[PDB]
A paper describes a structure:
We identify that SIDT1 has a ceramidase activity that is attenuated by cholesterol binding.
SIDT1 embedded in a GDN micelle exhibited the 2D averages of relatively resolved transmembrane helices and we successfully generated a reconstruction of hSIDT1 to an overall resolution of 2.77 Å. The lipid-like densities were inserted at the cytoplasmic side of TM region. These densities were fitted to cholesterol molecules and Mass spectrometry analysis identified cholesterol in purified hSIDT1. The two densities run parallel to each other in a small concave formed by TM5, TM6, and TM7 at the intracellular side, which can be modeled as cholesterol molecules. Another cholesterol molecule (CLR2) is packed with TM5 and TM7. These cholesterol molecules were surrounded by hydrophobic residues, most of which are conserved in mammalian SID-1 family proteins, suggesting that the cholesterols serve as molecular glue that stabilizes the conformation of TM5, TM6, and TM7.SIDT1 is previously reported to bind cholesterol via CRAC motif16 characterized by the sequence (L/V)-X1−5-(Y)-X1−5-(K/R)25. On the extracellular side of the TM helices, we detected density that would be assignable to Zn2+, being tetrahedrally coordinated with His563, Asp574, His791 and His795. In the cholesterol-bound form of SIDT1, Zn2+ is coordinated by the conserved three His residues and Asp residue, in which there is no space for a water molecule which is activated through the coordination with Zn2+.
Author numbering:
A (entry chain C), B (entry chain A): 44 to 275, 283 to 332, 444 to 528, 535 to 648, 681 to 825
The structure:
Amino acid sequence: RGADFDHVYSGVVNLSTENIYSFNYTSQPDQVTAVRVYVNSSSENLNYPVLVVVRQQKEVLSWQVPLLFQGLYQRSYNYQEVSRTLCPSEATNETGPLQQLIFVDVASMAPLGAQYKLLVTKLKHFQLRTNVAFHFTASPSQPQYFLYKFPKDVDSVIIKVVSEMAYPCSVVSVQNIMCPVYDLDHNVEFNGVYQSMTKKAAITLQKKDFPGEQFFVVFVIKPEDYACGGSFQTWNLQRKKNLEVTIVPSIKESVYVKSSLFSVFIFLSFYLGCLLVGFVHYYFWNIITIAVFYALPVIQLVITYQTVVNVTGNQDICYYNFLCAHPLGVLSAFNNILSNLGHVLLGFLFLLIVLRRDILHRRALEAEYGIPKHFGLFYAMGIALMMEGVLSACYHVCPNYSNFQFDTSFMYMIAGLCMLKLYQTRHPDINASAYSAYASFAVVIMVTVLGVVFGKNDVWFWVIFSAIHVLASLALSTQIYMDRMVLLVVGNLVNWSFALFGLIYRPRDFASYMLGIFICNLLLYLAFYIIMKLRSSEKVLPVPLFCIVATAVMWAAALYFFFQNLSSWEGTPAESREKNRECILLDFFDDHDIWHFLSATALFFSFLVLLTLDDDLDVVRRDQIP
Amino acid sequence: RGADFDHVYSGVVNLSTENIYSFNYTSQPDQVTAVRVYVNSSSENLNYPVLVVVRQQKEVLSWQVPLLFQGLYQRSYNYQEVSRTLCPSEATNETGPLQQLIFVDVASMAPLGAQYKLLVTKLKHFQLRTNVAFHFTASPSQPQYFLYKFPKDVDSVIIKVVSEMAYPCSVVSVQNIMCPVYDLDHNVEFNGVYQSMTKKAAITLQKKDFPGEQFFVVFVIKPEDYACGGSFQTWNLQRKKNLEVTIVPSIKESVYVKSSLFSVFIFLSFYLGCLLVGFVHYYFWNIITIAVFYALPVIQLVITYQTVVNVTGNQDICYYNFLCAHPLGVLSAFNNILSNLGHVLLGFLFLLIVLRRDILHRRALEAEYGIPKHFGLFYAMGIALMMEGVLSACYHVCPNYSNFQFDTSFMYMIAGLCMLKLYQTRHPDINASAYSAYASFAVVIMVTVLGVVFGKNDVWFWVIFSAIHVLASLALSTQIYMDRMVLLVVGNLVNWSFALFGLIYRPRDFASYMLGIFICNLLLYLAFYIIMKLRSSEKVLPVPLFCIVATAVMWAAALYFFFQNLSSWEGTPAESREKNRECILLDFFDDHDIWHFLSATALFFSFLVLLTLDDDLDVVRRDQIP
Ligand SMILES: *[C@@H]1O[C@H](CO)[C@@H](O[C@@H]2O[C@H](CO)[C@@H](O[C@@H]3O[C@H](CO)[C@@H](O)[C@H](O)[C@@H]3O)[C@H](O)[C@H]2NC(C)=O)[C@H](O)[C@H]1NC(C)=O
Ligand SMILES: *[C@@H]1O[C@H](CO)[C@@H](O[C@@H]2O[C@H](CO)[C@@H](O[C@@H]3O[C@H](CO)[C@@H](O)[C@H](O)[C@@H]3O)[C@H](O)[C@H]2NC(C)=O)[C@H](O)[C@H]1NC(C)=O
Ligand SMILES: *[C@@H]1O[C@H](CO)[C@@H](O[C@@H]2O[C@H](CO)[C@@H](O[C@@H]3O[C@H](CO)[C@@H](O)[C@H](O)[C@@H]3O)[C@H](O)[C@H]2NC(C)=O)[C@H](O)[C@H]1NC(C)=O
Ligand SMILES: *[C@@H]1O[C@H](CO)[C@@H](O[C@@H]2O[C@H](CO)[C@@H](O[C@@H]3O[C@H](CO)[C@@H](O)[C@H](O)[C@@H]3O)[C@H](O)[C@H]2NC(C)=O)[C@H](O)[C@H]1NC(C)=O
Ligand SMILES: *[C@@H]1O[C@H](CO)[C@@H](O[C@@H]2O[C@H](CO)[C@@H](O)[C@H](O)[C@H]2NC(C)=O)[C@H](O)[C@H]1NC(C)=O
Ligand SMILES: *[C@@H]1O[C@H](CO)[C@@H](O[C@@H]2O[C@H](CO)[C@@H](O)[C@H](O)[C@H]2NC(C)=O)[C@H](O)[C@H]1NC(C)=O
Ligand SMILES: *[C@@H]1O[C@H](CO)[C@@H](O[C@@H]2O[C@H](CO)[C@@H](O)[C@H](O)[C@H]2NC(C)=O)[C@H](O)[C@H]1NC(C)=O
Ligand SMILES: *[C@@H]1O[C@H](CO)[C@@H](O[C@@H]2O[C@H](CO)[C@@H](O)[C@H](O)[C@H]2NC(C)=O)[C@H](O)[C@H]1NC(C)=O
Ligand SMILES: CC(C)CCC[C@@H](C)[C@H]1CC[C@H]2[C@@H]3CC=C4C[C@@H](O)CC[C@]4(C)[C@H]3CC[C@]12C
Ligand SMILES: CC(C)CCC[C@@H](C)[C@H]1CC[C@H]2[C@@H]3CC=C4C[C@@H](O)CC[C@]4(C)[C@H]3CC[C@]12C
Ligand SMILES: CC(C)CCC[C@@H](C)[C@H]1CC[C@H]2[C@@H]3CC=C4C[C@@H](O)CC[C@]4(C)[C@H]3CC[C@]12C
Ligand SMILES: CC(C)CCC[C@@H](C)[C@H]1CC[C@H]2[C@@H]3CC=C4C[C@@H](O)CC[C@]4(C)[C@H]3CC[C@]12C
Ligand SMILES: [Zn+2]
Ligand SMILES: [Zn+2]
């Protein structure tokens, strides 16, 4: 039977009958026409469904209405409205116009008969345009896909999909032009690149990875939300999701060289400003072998994760900030690796400042008027700043749950090395072995990895950790040891307020909770050392006084950017994608990349406080005050 | 048109016609009947394929003949013979006999017409029997699946699939009874448990994980071999694979307690035999903090791999010996973990022997006639034997490429600690710090992980490693240092023969190649120490003479079982499954589990040689010979 588009056909079909509708149209040699088939059936007899077969010249497509889904824990779902878009055949100038037939056959095995309703339409907004937002609606029985053609200017696009409600859970997939299109639950992750999505998604593509410089963008809704965060609305027989897709061209290669030269010439401006004021006046092996032995678990691991996300299309592994992930060859986020250049550049500059202070100290001993200068741990800290950037750049190749500590765990060593040197400046009788720096670092990683996994924010771990936190502060207070007893009980109250804050709220990101312990204890013992210099008759020279004000304004700026989370391994990867944000600096760097820039500067100026604070006493002779 | 089973129907179909065959049969209320549909088409016009639709009461099934496949690097394959088995509806005593209809519709859009051939048969050997081997043949366009029903006796079965040729690459899947059965390339890994397979497969199942105590065993052949080892025969239009499946009941729970009590009472017999001869006569903290800091990368990792293989059905991750993998709760191979009990039991016994020798040494100093007894590294070795079993049991939770070293890497530390104590017995002036045991261990792990990955068996790594191996032996020879010069050049020739053996063959398993360096250098310097005692006038007491003969017969037995590989992370998981073997001891332990038993005994008796070799000189007074 010859039928018409945009007309709703209704009928009844039983075991003897089979309705056949033949649809006939013509494809123009430049535009593309997509056909969608709508089938209803308001028949709840689920022992005799309505079977619908759609035949084309080169394909056959079949489904049953009502569509059935088997969820977890033995739950069944019905869907009385099924919609499928047939794979379009594109006519070109080598072919001309093409007359195409489509046969739709409706059949059922019910003895009494089953009622249905059929509608076949041509899609008008099938081809997506560049930088134009397009709104549509999908369903677990009504998947959608659209076409995007690459312009000759653009070589890389980003597919930004936005939804204002977290549920139903969905899948956004990118596939080839070659038929068939996989738009069902069991085949959408077969080939192509896909992402799970509750509220946001972002897929970055290259023009060189597609033959005809075109792809399909497939939208499939899931019947349950177990792959996403939740589980299982006024009689939700249909799990409709309102989506909005925008295809934005990526940044050009001039942004790759303008932003990379920024991240070098900013930290090389520290080199020029250091040798200028040098012109005006005109254990490290131990910490590297801790670093590279702690590192090699992730080099053996993140090169497998970065390949699995590339040889498959499973982009649910590596937890990036997908709205600010700029690839370079194999790496999928080059800006997260390039932003750690400030650690290895300012950490190398701090070694050249100590080496200038060490050569000009041995040349003065060949020809007492100060505290004994010990440049041992100063070499140990500038190395530890350099190894912090190497460890965290390896984390950002594929951030996930199995390497989460490697963003900031080596900063516990840096904060531990700073509090030991500040104790060493007026207690030179200490002797910390190279094993003790390895063993005390190994027990603060263990309790971190455990807290996040086993602790799993339960009250059994948080109480006994709060007891460890309050007796550690009670041990270091009298070890440091009359206004001396006044400061040594204020600093316990800051650690006690820190202990009960994590006890009543239980922050799940325990690796960032351990940073707050090591930073505030650093910024208290450094703050108590200045007040002890000012309660005595000791002034502050303008060179350390600049570095104290610099340390306070760079740590307050870095701790602001530290709290804007743009990714989270704590939940599902679709839950982490809801917090993705665009780049805010030079269209290359997000909030987490400025934290890599400003925590390498705040730790550098914290080093320069510990080096030049006691240069008041380099003219005051010894046997005066300790 | 009413049609008959086991009859070949042939016809021609064009755009106007559509042949319809109706098949009618009856299902008995205890047996099960499966229907298979065979379609040929010897028409190479691939612009107008033959479309075949099979309609049942509750399902619709469609495909096109010739079937098309898109391989990697733009290769297309045709298959002119397609065969599908329809999902059977089981009749029970609550239903009685069931009259079932099957409609087969053949259609094509060719203008001239397309020829086909149709055959519809009932499967006779559809239900698999227990402990009966069954041979069949499959194809990439002709998948197969069968039914297995659990007996009331059996609670766990193993599905052993055997093929005598490695190619074509295949997939063996286990699925539920609820229709549809996923037997195509794009849906066979959707739900259920699956395994890739070239030559062998073994899937262990529980009765409690299936609702009706029955499952389907799906066999799907792949169009290419890229997921397996190879790639892409006399005009192989069909990639036929001859398979053979056997379903064997698992071992009972009495085997779980008979084999576990064996592995305790054997190593507790060493305790009873030690205190009996004690009745006849009637740095460790440093090595644990090396161990648990080296361990915590895998506890954060293998608990994710063991869950992913459980929450999905991807059994291509954990590289077990699947023919000797016996589960216990969450773990999928309990015998690989239980076999490491000999390390923690014989390592704890060695500490109690040294502690008995240490308490009876301090009690003798309160009341010279020997070499100075130093029990420092003796505590360090018995701890290192205990931590070797903890590290390798964590490896066998999920062995793969990301944790491969943790089977045997801590034995490099054990062999290194033995060669240092044997140097210490007649050179007591040595002072090896606790950091130097950590730093020298960290550089032999680095060069191992690298050799396996980057080295990747290329000549650029193997030449420069052979140069490191020959100057290390040239450094330790004169450090040990006239028949003394005779032995110190024979031991270089064993290291030189070891250097060129790995250079001309390039063993890819470099972690086992590093074991051969550390073991032979241990078994040479221990062998040279006995000859130096016998070239002088020093006898051997019967207690160390028993332990020397015990060390030689337990290391020769353990190195035999070390070379029978039953798994390999070097290739694809389907390539590793070809080397799986059945258990040889108590139906619980394979060849790799006896290596865990005999290398904990050979290392224990190697400890007892180093402890009691110099008990000749405990009656000879000092100032006699060094
Ligand atoms: C397939 O054949 C058609 C028919 O020739 C091609 O369409 C033609 O494309 C050219 C190039 O874009 C058009 O020229 C343009 O005309 C506009 C005026 O509208 C002018 O402003 C531009 O500067 C340019 O000269 C031409 O009008 C257009 N003709 C028709 C009838 O559409 C088409 O490009 C061919 N496609 C391929 C892939 O070869
Ligand atoms: C299968 O059944 C469903 C529901 O019975 C049909 O959906 C209905 O579609 C019509 C036409 O698109 C909708 O009517 C119009 O809706 C707009 C938007 O709300 C409204 O502004 C108009 O005044 C008009 O009522 C109708 O609302 C919609 N029903 C629901 C519940 O959303 C569907 O069309 C059926 N499929 C076929 C092939 O017949
Ligand atoms: C569904 O109904 C049929 C019909 O009764 C059941 O078949 C019957 O099953 C019993 C138990 O296995 C059979 O008894 C056995 O007979 C053999 C002699 O062949 C004897 O050696 C055994 O000791 C036992 O007594 C019985 O013969 C058999 N009857 C028929 C006609 O097959 C069937 O078990 C029912 N299924 C379910 C799931 O309830
Ligand atoms: C589609 O075409 C293929 C090949 O043209 C058909 O396979 C052929 O099936 C027949 C009957 O099963 C085979 O004949 C018998 O084979 C056995 C085993 O070799 C032999 O011992 C007998 O003497 C007899 O020849 C025939 O060998 C086989 N052809 C090949 C190349 O294996 C298939 O049956 C066709 N499908 C339909 C539905 O007609
Ligand atoms: C359902 O099947 C029956 C027979 O199995 C058919 O019923 C038709 O009913 C109309 C109205 O009474 C009459 O023309 C005949 O009794 C039947 N027509 C034919 C052509 O057999 C029919 O196949 C189905 N009924 C429908 C589609 O309404
Ligand atoms: C689909 O519709 C078109 C018309 O839109 C049909 O084309 C006509 O075909 C007849 C017979 O070949 C010609 O006499 C007419 O002149 C054609 N009209 C046009 C506008 O081209 C076409 O045949 C239809 N397809 C089928 C399969 O029937
Ligand atoms: C192919 O289609 C044509 C028409 O499009 C039909 O050809 C038949 O040929 C036979 C033998 O010459 C004659 O009975 C008629 O010319 C046609 N029969 C009918 C019923 O139209 C037929 O549909 C197809 N040919 C086949 C199946 O052989
Ligand atoms: C399938 O075949 C069976 C016979 O094997 C058919 O059963 C017959 O049905 C007619 C009409 O209802 C009865 O008069 C006969 O007595 C039945 N015979 C038997 C042996 O049961 C059955 O009708 C067929 N199915 C269809 C849909 O035609
Ligand atoms: C902070 C971590 C990550 C890095 C390691 C630095 C800290 C923890 C290390 C380095 C120097 C070490 C201390 C040096 C000296 C002493 C005094 C001794 O009587 C007990 C151990 C103790 C107290 C050491 C253990 C902890 C210590 C303070
Ligand atoms: C994070 C680390 C660096 C903690 C900072 C404190 C370090 C640098 C200093 C501060 C006070 C010091 C302690 C002061 C007093 C004692 C008691 C003495 O019998 C052994 C050393 C010991 C235990 C010192 C170890 C090092 C120490 C703990
Ligand atoms: C074998 C590995 C895995 C475990 C570590 C044990 C070995 C390698 C360690 C422990 C004792 C160490 C040696 C002890 C003393 C010396 C002499 C000194 O002048 C150079 C370093 C050197 C040579 C040390 C480095 C290597 C050494 C032999
Ligand atoms: C795997 C490890 C234990 C190697 C075994 C050899 C160890 C135990 C012994 C054997 C000979 C020893 C060396 C003999 C001579 C020297 C030269 C001296 O100026 C420094 C120590 C040094 C370098 C010794 C270090 C320890 C040493 C290397
Ligand atoms: Zn970071
Ligand atoms: Zn092992």
